[PDB]
Structure formats: C-alpha cells, structure tokens
Amino acid sequence: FPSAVTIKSWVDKMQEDLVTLAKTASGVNQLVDIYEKYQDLYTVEPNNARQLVEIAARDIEKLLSNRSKALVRLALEAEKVQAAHQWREDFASNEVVYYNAKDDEPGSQRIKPVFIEDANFGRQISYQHAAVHIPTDIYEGSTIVLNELNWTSALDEVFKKNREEDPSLLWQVFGSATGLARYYPASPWVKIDLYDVRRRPWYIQGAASPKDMLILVDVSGSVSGLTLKLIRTSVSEMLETLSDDDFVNVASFNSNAQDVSCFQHLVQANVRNKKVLKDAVNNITAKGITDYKKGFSFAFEQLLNYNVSRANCNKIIMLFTDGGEERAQEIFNKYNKDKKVRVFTFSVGQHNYDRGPIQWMACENKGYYYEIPSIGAIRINTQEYLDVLGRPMVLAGDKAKQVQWTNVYLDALELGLVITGTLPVFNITGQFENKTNLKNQLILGVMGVDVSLEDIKRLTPRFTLCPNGYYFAIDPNGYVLLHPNLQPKPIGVGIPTINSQEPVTLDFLDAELENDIKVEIRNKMIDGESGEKTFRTLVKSQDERYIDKGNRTYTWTPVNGTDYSLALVLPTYSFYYIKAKLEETITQARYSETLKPDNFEESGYTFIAPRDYCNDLKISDNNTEFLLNFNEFIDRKTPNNPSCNADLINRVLLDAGFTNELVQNYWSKQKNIKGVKARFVVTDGGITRVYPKEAGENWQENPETYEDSFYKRSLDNDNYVFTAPYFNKSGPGAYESGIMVSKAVEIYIQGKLLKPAVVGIKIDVNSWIENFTKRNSDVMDCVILDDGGFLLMANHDDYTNQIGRFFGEIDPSLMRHLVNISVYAFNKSYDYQSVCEPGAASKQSCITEQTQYFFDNDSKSFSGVLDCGNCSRIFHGEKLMNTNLIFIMVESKGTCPCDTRLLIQAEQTSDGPNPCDMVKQPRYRKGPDVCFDNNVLEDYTDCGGVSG
C-alpha cells in the first residue's frame, strides 16, 4: 500500500494529462474565441420570465376561450333543435340518413363517405358529415335511437361552422344519454368493441357534480355463489365511474360492519386508492347473518367524519344486496331525518328473496333501485345513478353550465394525449310555456371538444431558451397538464401479475425530483397566485443515471379563464440568448452550402435537429432524408418565407457558419491524434458535427440538441464531464468508440454568461488504459469511477472487459462502504409511466423504482479501512480536479474472500409508495367550489321498483 503523497502525484499527473488532452483536442478556447470575435452577426436578448409566462398563459386562455365558445354554440343549437321535435313512431318512408361508424335494418339509410387523408389526425377523415357510434349491445333502428338520430342530424351544420371558424379544431362530439355519440369530423371507428359514451370521463364529469360515494356490500351467508362474483364485478365497475374529484370508501356488513381495506375513511378515489379498493373487494368471503341497521349506522357515521379532505358535495350510500326483510326505519329517521343523503340500492343475482324493503329504502331517501341479475346487466346498471344526481344540476338552470376540462387522457380514436371541454345539454321541450317538467329533469347528453397537448405545447416555445429550462402547467388537483417528463402512455399501478381507459394523472411531485421547496411552490400554484422563486435544486439527467446540483428559478402565474397554473423553469446562464441578425444573402449562402451531405469528408459528418422550422418541411427522424429535405428547401426557397419563421433558420445557419470555422481552421489541421477516436461539437442552433467519418455511424446520440443528456449535464457543470457507455452489448461504443468527454463553452459579450454550445471528444479506451498502466496486479486493484459510480478504468483486465457498469454491481462490499461514509449520496424515485415484463401469478405498465448516485461532500481526499470480517482492507480515493472523476485503490477481492449481495442501480420494479399511510397525510389539493344537490323542486317520486 503506497503512501498518500505518491498517489496524489499520480492522480495529479493523469488528471493534468486528461484535461490537457481534452482542452487541446476539443478546442474549447478556439470556439470561445470564434464566438467572441464576431459580435456583429448576432445580438444578445434577455429572457425575462415574468412576461414570457404571462404571454404563454394568455395564449392558453385564448385557446380555451375559442373552445368554450364552440362548446356554448353547440349546446345552444342542440337544445334549440331538440326542443322542436315531434317523436314520430315510424320510420318506413321517412328514412334517417347518417353515417354509422364501424361498418365495412329497416328505418334508416347509410352514407358512404370519401375519407380523404388529412393531417392533424392519424387517420382518414371526411368533413362532409358527422359519424355516429352506437354501442354493440344497443340496437340501431329502434324508436329511441332513430328519434335521437333524426333530431341530432341538425348538429352537422354547427360542427361545420365551428370547424370553419377555427381550422385547428379537433373532435367535436355529442354524447347522448341514449348511448350513441355523434362526432365530427367523420372517421371510421378504431376484436370486439366495448366502447360506451356514458362511461367516458368527460361525460361522467359533465353529467353531475363531484360525489362522496360510500358502498355497502352485503357479505352475509345468502350472497355466497354467483351473486357474490356479480357483486364484486358490479362494485369494480362502479368504482370505474369515479374520478379524482370524487371520494369513495367501501364497507361490508354481516351482523357487524367494517371497512374492507386499510383506509377507514373516504379517500380521493384516484388510481392507487381505486386499485386498493378493488383488490380488497376481490378478497371478500360470504358468511354470517345480515344486519341492515349496523351496516347503515356504519355508513352514516362514515359520511360525518369531516376530519379529512372530502368533496362536500353529493353524499350517497350505494347498497349492494340480494333481498331482505328489514326496512330499518329507525336508522334512516335518526341519521338523515331531513333526507340530506341519497341511498341507491342494488339487488344482485338470480334469487327469490323479497325486494320490497330494498325498493322502499331507495324511494324514501331520494335514491333509486336497480336489478343486476347477470354479467350483461352490470355495465348499464352501474352508470344509471348519474341520472338521479343530475336533477339538481338541470333544476339550477343556466348557472349550471360551465365549461370544465378533464384530466389528461389518451384519446379513444388514437390522437394522443388530449383534454376535453365539457358542457351539459338540457331537455327544454315544453319549457317555452313551462308545462312538462316531468322528463325535462334529465340531461339529453354532453358536449365535448378535444384539445391535444401538442396544441398547448405549440404556445410555449422552448428553442429561445437553454435545454435545461421548460414550461409546466399544473391542475388544481396537483397533476401536470404539461411537462417534459409526461409521456403518452398510461400510468402504472403495482406489479403486473397474471395467471388504457384510465386518465394519465401524474402529480407534479412525481414528474420530477421532490423537494421541500417544490411542495411550497406547488401549493402556491394550486390555489392560484403569481410568484417567483430562485433556489438550488438537484436535477436528474435526461437518462435516469445521473443527478447534478444546479440553480433554478421557477416563475409561475395563474391562467385567468381556467384553473390551471403555468410555471417556467429557467436556470442561470440562460437569461440571455443569441438572436442572429443578418439580412445579407451572400453570407446566408456561404453558410448554407456548408451542410452538403456529399461534402462531409472534410467538414465532418453533420447531423441536423429535426425541428419544425415550418409547415413545408416535414420531419422524418432519419436525418439523412431530413437533411436532404432541409438543404433542398434552403437552396430552393426565397428568403421571404410567407409562412416559415426564419429565426430558427437564422440561428441554425449562424451556428453552422461558426462550426464551419471551428472544424476547418482548427480540427482539420490535426487530422489524426493518438488518444482520440472522435471529436464532436453540438450547438443550440440545432446541429452537431463529428469529424471522423467512420465515427458518424457510431454517434448514438439523438439529432435534437435539446434531447441530449450529455449536453444538459455539461451545461450544469463548469468542468469536463465524462459519460460512461452503456453495458452488455447495446450496440457499438464499448470498445470501438471510447469514453465520451464533453465541455460547455462560456461566452462573455457584454459580461453576460452565455453557453451557446458544447464540444467534446471520445478517448480511445486502449490508449487510455495504456497511459493508465504507466496491470493485472493480483495484489491490489486501482479503478476510476465517475459521478455516479460507473466503471471507467480497471486494472485486472476482466473488469476492463465490462466497462461502463455500476461499481456496486461488481464490488458491492466497497460500494456500500463508500455510500456509508458519505462520499456518495443517493436518491430514489418512482417512475409510473414504465413498461416491464410480467410475473408468475408481452409487457405491461408498472411502477419502477430508480436510484441515482452523486457526490455527497465537497472534500476531495478520502482514506479508510473496510472490515469485512476476518479481514481488513485499506482503501484510498482522490477526486480528480476540474472534472467529475475519482480514483480509488483497494486490495484485490481475493485477499478477503467476502462478497455480500450485489448493489444494483437499475430499473427495479416495485409498487411503492404504500397508500395506507399515504392517505393519512395527503398532498394539498383544491376542489371545485360549485356543488349542485338537494334542490327543493326535485321530483324524486320515481324509483326503479315502482315501474318494475
């Protein structure tokens, strides 16, 4: 074991060699000088967040205002047209003409459309008319459906008017209480089809107000058998009808009432809680004697908690029995004396018990009685309770017409992530003279208009700011409407164990790394108020392997019209951006004919960022086709560009010109360098250049500058950054490309700190380990790790074979000791939008736990002794200056024959966090302030038992 002085000398020598090699081959100062000398082809412009966030908020508000105007127009026309209807009972000669979707009966005709291919949709559409979807188990050609089709045939004119007034308009849909949906533009529908309009989240949120559902399940002996599996399926289907604004709990009684799970009070009824409740209700067994009084007392006591967050709206008890003999007048009289709580009752299964008390309990408490004798009746009967809850909303009048917006969800017609604006439609036939009032207390249906998240993203440009900043909008529930980490895939729950109809609800604290200041900012945004806050965060890298600490500023404002709150995340060194200023065509050409694909042998292989410069250029991500399209467009277009913004074009041409001088004047002079296998440069303008042509196909980086992990990692740091290659044959790069090293250039025009681009090289691994040797020493091992504990240097030539691997996966004994002595800190997180292989009980959605390691303390020297039992191994470690590299030595693994379980840093599937103790102290949220219930003029004189 050598002393500390010699090891410090070796570390200093090799770190100076590496820094000098990188500074010379990359040419950081040469590019800095190139950027510094011109100062005339461009200018420096501020990035003042306070007006940027407000401008983006105003744009989002205007978009939502257009959508709300269209919704109001559609609702008004639908009400007016349905008011003047005749209800004809025959359709023999008066045929109904409509285009039925999902097609390749007497009473109606069929339309054959043209179906031209059109953009903004991933399918073939027709603007000539509207398509109609009728669920499979609903017969088209009956009197109800034919009358509905006839009176809804008049909505196509308003669909066309809305589309003409705003071409950038997606689906417009009328969802009927009959069951059909008429949507525009007409498209063919997407095995068997189980789509039902009345089960959709937008229809459900528009059909009533939030609720406080409580489900009583009878688990006595008489429900054993098929009337128990039907009860379980019905409870699951009814839980499927709730949302994040509704609060639910499930209780079961057999001579004694108790909660079926760990909750013990109403919960937010989100994905995790609903999954827990479904799992709990799947585990109930039937035994005992029914006692309605105890179960109803439990249910009534559960709705008077008020110590927990609730909806403070519709309070309903949803009883699931077969048939009893007790009416329990005392419990109903005692608890809801004034009938402030509704009681819906369900009789499940095929049996011969008495249904009288069930119907009486439904009728005496503003409720409704339903019969579910088979599986086929489960879906319809578990969604009809929204008709009863909608009576106070229709009786409210025009005050109960407010455009609401759903959570982010995947469109049924394969359009991506969308939100839906919603407006209910009322039945007002005979309300001109105000005489019917009998069936006019139910809604006709729901208006819907879809807004894709790409439309919202188009209103928040990000190319005028560094790849680190971004925008994000937050729901008053804490979910993110817009975020870089949000993905177009359903969020996972638990672990998929087997023998996308849910909303994509991702919380703000789950999209990025949580912090004590993140919670404060999120709470300040949820209630709604402008503000700004600068602080120092620890940020995860684009690839989930690194964490680095950097300064950030969050500037947030509320959107006026809606309840979303929009915030901009902007780091330092990005308050100023380079804006190209040039109107001379000669320099534009001298820059443009640099990017010729057949002229890369001397200019290096060039990659273009597939940015949407304008509509004429269509991205392809091949970057060979796209580069040819780009330079053909540049060489074949006049600079007028009627609908093609040149600011991106100006920036990319200016950066191409800068890179041309960087490559020709400096890189070309030294064609070959010993310890270099590739030299690369990436810029914010949207290009990268790799000098070796043979390294062009080994450049496994995304062409877009803003999506490169190493770019942002180098921006955050102020020193050279190493990147460990991926492990276990993920292609080329382990031995044939080398270790990638990057460094970001800093520019001072008027003293402002600017980072327009990054440079870097790829050290040849063979020459680098050869310089390291000056090998196979069985006495001691000497390795180099990066910030993250990934292997970069080895000594035994077997570890060298497996490079770019986590240190703990091969030598956990010393990795755990390093973590213990606080030389590496680590943080874990949950990824909910991940797919994985299932397990014993294709790939499915799951929650995966991720771990990331980073430097703990600012100290640079460490030494100590590891006691692994019956041995004692001394170890030393020094962090290389002006980089993120550490050199550590210890005795060989053979000296002490101990090997504990290996420390894995990877995508570990899990199911955390536990929701039983998560609901004890829930996150802050704000609920809607509009509640419609207990209207005095409610009829409520009809249940499901009097008619049947």
Ligand X SMILES: *[C@@H]1O[C@H](CO)[C@@H](O[C@@H]2O[C@H](CO)[C@@H](O[C@@H]3O[C@H](CO)[C@@H](O)[C@H](O)[C@H]3NC(C)=O)[C@H](O)[C@H]2NC(C)=O)[C@H](O)[C@H]1NC(C)=O
Ligand Y SMILES: *[C@@H]1O[C@H](CO)[C@@H](O)[C@H](O)[C@H]1NC(C)=O
Ligand Z SMILES: *[C@@H]1O[C@H](CO)[C@@H](O[C@@H]2O[C@H](CO)[C@@H](O)[C@H](O)[C@H]2NC(C)=O)[C@H](O)[C@H]1NC(C)=O
Ligand U SMILES: *[C@@H]1O[C@H](CO)[C@@H](O[C@@H]2O[C@H](CO)[C@@H](O[C@@H]3O[C@H](CO)[C@@H](O[C@@H]4O[C@H](CO)[C@@H](O)[C@H](O)[C@H]4NC(C)=O)[C@H](O)[C@H]3NC(C)=O)[C@H](O)[C@H]2NC(C)=O)[C@H](O)[C@H]1NC(C)=O
Task: Name, in order, each residue with C-beta under 8 angstroms of 400's C-beta and a sequence gap of 6 or more.
Answer: 393, 394, 424, 932
- Where do contacts with ligand Y occur on this chain (CB under 6 A)? 59, 62-63, 66, 165-166, 728
Kindly state the tokens that stand for 377: 């009746």
Is 709 marked within a binding site? Answer: no
Binding of residue 551 to ligand Z (CB under 6 A)? no
| 531 vs 696, beta carbon nearer ligand Z | 531
Class of residue 499 by CB neighbours under 10 A (exposed 0-12, middle 13-18, buried 19+):
exposed
Exactly one of 33, 54, 59, 364 binds ligand Z (CB under 6 A); that residue is 54
Report the partner that residue 827 touches, choosing among ligand Z, ligand Y, Ca ion, none (CB closer than 5 to 8 A by kind): ligand Z
Binding of residue 98 to ligand X (CB under 6 A)? no
Beta carbon of residue 807, minimum distance to ligand Y (angstroms, whole number): 14
Report the partner that residue 329 touches, choosing among ligand X, Ca ion, ligand U, none (CB closer than 5 to 8 A by kind): none
Task: Name, in order, each residue with C-beta under 8 angstroms of 653's C-beta and a sequence gap of 6 or more.
Answer: 580, 588, 591, 592, 685
DSSP code for 211: B
| 76 vs 517, beta carbon nearer ligand Z | 517
| 182 vs 817, beta carbon nearer ligand X | 182
Report CA torsion sign: 429, 430, 431, 437.
negative
| 728 vs 776, beta carbon nearer ligand Y | 728
Angle at 597 between CA 596 and CA 601, to 5 degrees: 100
CA distance linking residue 680 with residue 741, whole number of Å:
10
Of 104, 68, 106, nearest to 90 by C-alpha is 106
Binding of residue 429 to ligand X (CB under 6 A)? no
Report CA torsion sign: 837, 843, 847, 848.
positive
Beta carbon of residue 330, minimum distance to ligand U (angstroms, whole number): 37
Beta carbon of residue 350, minimum distance to ligand X (angstroms, whole number): 41
Report CA torsion sign: 314, 315, 318, 323.
negative
| 222 vs 427, beta carbon nearer ligand U | 427
Residue with tokens 């744009």: 59
Q: What residues numbered 927-946 form the site for ligand U, per CB under 6 A?
A: none
Q: What's the N-to-C CA distance of the chain in angstroms?
A: 92
Binding of residue 222 to Ca ion (CB under 5 A)? yes
Is 842 marked within a binding site? Answer: no
Find the part of the chain contacting Ca ion (CB under 5 A) among 24-32, 288-296, 745-753, 866-874.
288-296
Report the partner that residue 220 touches, choosing among ligand Z, ligand X, Ca ion, none (CB closer than 5 to 8 A by kind): Ca ion
| 94 vs 624, beta carbon nearer ligand X | 94
Report the partner that residue 62 touches, choosing among Ca ion, ligand Z, ligand Y, none (CB closer than 5 to 8 A by kind): ligand Y
Binding of residue 57 to ligand Z (CB under 6 A)? yes
| 558 vs 703, beta carbon nearer ligand Z | 558
Binding of residue 81 to ligand X (CB under 6 A)? yes
Beta carbon of residue 81, minimum distance to ligand U (angstroms, whole number): 11
DSSP code for 845: E
Binding of residue 696 to ligand U (CB under 6 A)? no
CA distance linking residue 574 with residue 753, whole number of Å:
8
Give all strands (DSSP E) within 427-564, no chain letters.
443-452, 470-474, 480-482, 497-498, 531-540, 547-558
Q: How many residues bind ligand U (CB under 6 A)?
A: 11
Binding of residue 557 to ligand Z (CB under 6 A)? yes
Of 39, 44, 28, nearest to 662 by C-alpha is 28
Exactly one of 39, 43, 94, 168 binds ligand X (CB under 6 A); that residue is 94
The alpha carbon of residue 458 and the mean position of all alpha carbons in its chain are separated, in whole angstroms, by 17
| 290 vs 594, beta carbon nearer Ca ion | 290
Kindly state the tokens that stand for 35: 């950027």
Strands 249-253 and 214-218: parallel
Beta carbon of residue 455, minimum distance to ligand Y (angstroms, whole number): 8
How many angstroms separate the Cα of 279 from the Cα of each of 71, 235, 272, 909? 39, 11, 11, 19
Q: What residues numbered 415-434 form the site for ligand U, per CB under 6 A?
A: 427, 429-430
Exactly one of 40, 89, 398, 598 binds ligand U (CB under 6 A); that residue is 89
Is 118 marked within a binding site? Answer: no
Binding of residue 922 to ligand U (CB under 6 A)? no
Exactly one of 32, 111, 144, 154 binds ligand X (CB under 6 A); that residue is 154
Kindly state the tokens that stand for 814: 């010393």
Give all strands (DSSP E) within 654-710, no chain letters.
678-683, 687-690
Q: Are 522 and 511 in contact (CB under 8 A)?
A: no
| 150 vs 172, beta carbon nearer ligand X | 150
Beta carbon of residue 194, minimum distance to ligand U (angstroms, whole number): 24
The helix (run of H) or strand (run of E) holding residue 259 is strand 257-259
- Binding interface with Ca ion (CB under 5 A): 220, 222, 290
- Binding interface with ligand Z (CB under 6 A): 54, 57-58, 307, 514-516, 538, 557, 560, 825-827
Annotated binding residues for a divalent metal cation? 218, 220, 222
- Binding interface with ligand U (CB under 6 A): 87, 89, 143, 427, 429-430, 436, 438-440, 444
- Binding interface with ligand X (CB under 6 A): 81, 94, 150-151, 153-154
Annotated binding residues? 218, 220, 222
